[PDB]
Subunit: 69 residues, 5 copies
């Protein structure tokens, strides 16, 4: 799956339908995998750099693949 | 959904029916989403600023949307 | 529900029937809510002050309401 | 249930059947309770002192009761 | 099961089928056990040394046994 954005997590958002939104770089993306919610908030809190891989690389796009550096 | 309060978490409370109460700004609100309980206690412990979005913006109102900054 | 003890968590214990015991102040109390186990060990590790509310305010009493400050 | 060992966690191990092994003091013991896995890794990472209570107090013995000081 | 790599976690990756990849030493390996995902990210964030035991000791190989010191 192609890389889409790499950067620190600027903010995260819990959504009304239990999906989770993340802003990394200049894109706002969401995931429906509940396992990723605490992993991404820990990355945010400790300042890790994440790379999100997705074909829907646009605002509002979904993802499931994340690399944590 | 409109913004209702933005601030640091002042305290959290675990309720008898397994919902979770939070006091942010001047409002005391609750959520029934179990996934938000450890995310909001981590935001409290590390001093993050949260924005709660809800139409029930009054004491005792419920919410499910939270932004973590 | 009335306040029973306020203080820092002295120790926590995992019990043979999957309940969790906590010692706050001068009372040792237990809860059967599994969601409270990691929230109380985080409060212990980061030194938060907790208030437990319960009518069974005696050693061995149960509880479910906790305020985290 | 009698005390068996008290000390800091030397290492933890994830086992092929999803049980979890811990070495505290001079004993290596395991638990089948999935709730204890992140509680024991947090105790190892932050250097807490744990007391394990079990009648199978020998290498390879199982336990479920742990006190976190 | 034989030791395969020992080292600090260099990166972790959440995969599209909910498995989790880890790079330790010179090998990139994956596990399908959901319980290991937050244990390995905590090991990565706090700089623990992990030993992965597996017979598939090659890039792309799977594992389930991890020692955390
Ligand atoms: O978290 C939501 C969602 O994330 C991942 O899917 C993403 C989009 O939501 C999904 O619509 C998109 O599907 C593409 C296929 O990748 C592509 O092969 C096909 O040609 O078109 C469809 C529709 O546009 O894929 C992205 C991820 O690349 C995740 O895969 C999905 O299971 C779900 O978790
Ligand atoms: O906001 C603080 C408040 O949160 C919790 O109460 C929630 C609502 O605020 C409250 O309106 C709601 O009341 C329920 C009662 O639980 C129920 O017994 C009764 O029959 O119906 C009313 C609504 O008409 O309760 C929710 C919780 O689900 C929290 O319980 C409360 O102590 C306080 O912290
Ligand atoms: O955790 C409780 C609850 O949070 C969210 O709902 C909030 C209030 O609890 C709910 O009463 C309120 O309902 C609104 C409708 O959204 C609005 O369309 C209608 O016009 O008025 C009612 C009453 O004010 O909505 C807020 C959130 O905006 C969450 O949606 C819900 O599932 C539940 O988790
Ligand atoms: O803290 C949330 C929750 O804690 C207690 O429930 C625990 C689990 O959260 C709950 O899913 C679990 O349910 C069991 C059934 O009791 C059992 O009959 C069935 O076979 O399996 C499910 C899943 O393992 O029960 C434990 C407590 O034993 C608490 O009871 C519950 O009300 C709520 O507070
Ligand atoms: O975690 C165990 C238990 O904690 C909470 O209940 C507590 C005691 O376990 C329970 O026996 C006690 O019951 C009270 C009633 O609240 C009171 O109205 C009646 O007059 O007397 C009995 C005995 O004193 O209540 C406390 C909490 O106040 C929790 O409510 C329960 O679900 C369970 O989790
Ligand atoms: O996590 C594994 C296991 O831990 C707890 O049980 C322990 C041993 O696994 C179990 O064999 C041992 O059984 C004892 C009885 O306690 C004792 O009453 C009887 O006389 O002898 C047997 C054999 O030694 O008990 C220990 C804990 O004392 C836990 O109870 C069990 O559910 C399971 O989690
Ligand atoms: O020294 C702790 C030990 O924990 C793990 O092994 C546990 C017991 O110590 C071990 O005796 C037990 O072995 C069982 C198998 O579970 C069972 O499937 C097989 O048929 O019989 C043997 C002997 O009764 O397994 C438990 C774990 O469930 C761990 O495997 C070991 O490396 C070591 O850490
Ligand atoms: O998470 C993936 C997987 O990890 C563990 O299995 C590993 C490989 O996935 C599996 O192919 C490999 O199988 C070995 C046999 O154990 C061995 O007896 C035989 O000689 O060779 C095959 C192929 O190399 O085993 C490794 C771990 O050693 C885990 O056991 C499995 O349940 C699953 O979690
Ligand atoms: O990330 C793990 C799973 O997350 C989502 O499922 C959640 C929850 O984990 C599951 O128990 C429940 O049945 O559905 C939830 C979403 O409605 C994904 O939808 C799953 O496919 C898993 O990836
Ligand atoms: O821009 C990111 C948004 O993510 C969530 O919405 C997505 C998606 O954008 C939307 O079209 C879809 O219907 O629902 C998804 C969530 O389930 C949030 O709900 C939005 O607030 C944005 O953060
Ligand atoms: O956040 C997870 C879900 O919370 C609420 O459900 C919880 C719990 O997760 C569920 O497994 C249980 O059966 O009921 C609980 C509520 O009584 C919400 O109802 C869900 O929408 C999820 O958000
Ligand atoms: O600690 C939680 C429970 O652990 C064991 O069960 C786990 C898991 O929690 C359960 O949902 C799954 O179906 O089986 C697992 C392996 O047995 C214990 O058997 C339970 O008593 C709980 O302690
Ligand atoms: O974490 C141990 C187990 O992980 C995998 O199962 C997960 C999850 O734990 C389970 O609750 C869910 O129903 O299915 C998931 C797999 O898609 C393993 O497959 C299990 O065998 C356990 O090892
Ligand atoms: O006060 C709560 C008590 O709960 C019991 O189940 C346990 O055996 C005691 O050791 C104590 O923890
Ligand atoms: O080399 C291990 C590989 O494991 C696969 O399951 C995963 O999809 C790949 O991205 C890679 O991590």
């Amino acid at each position: 799956t192609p890389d889409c954005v790499t950067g620190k997590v600027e903010y995260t958002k819990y959504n009304d339908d239990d999906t989770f939104t993340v802003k990394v770089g200049d894109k706002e993306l969401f995931t429906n995998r509940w396992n990723l919610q605490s992993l991404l908030l820990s990355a945010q809190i400790t300042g890790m750099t994440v790379t999100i891989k997705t074909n829907a690389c646009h605002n509002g796009g979904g993802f499931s693949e994340v690399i944590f550096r």
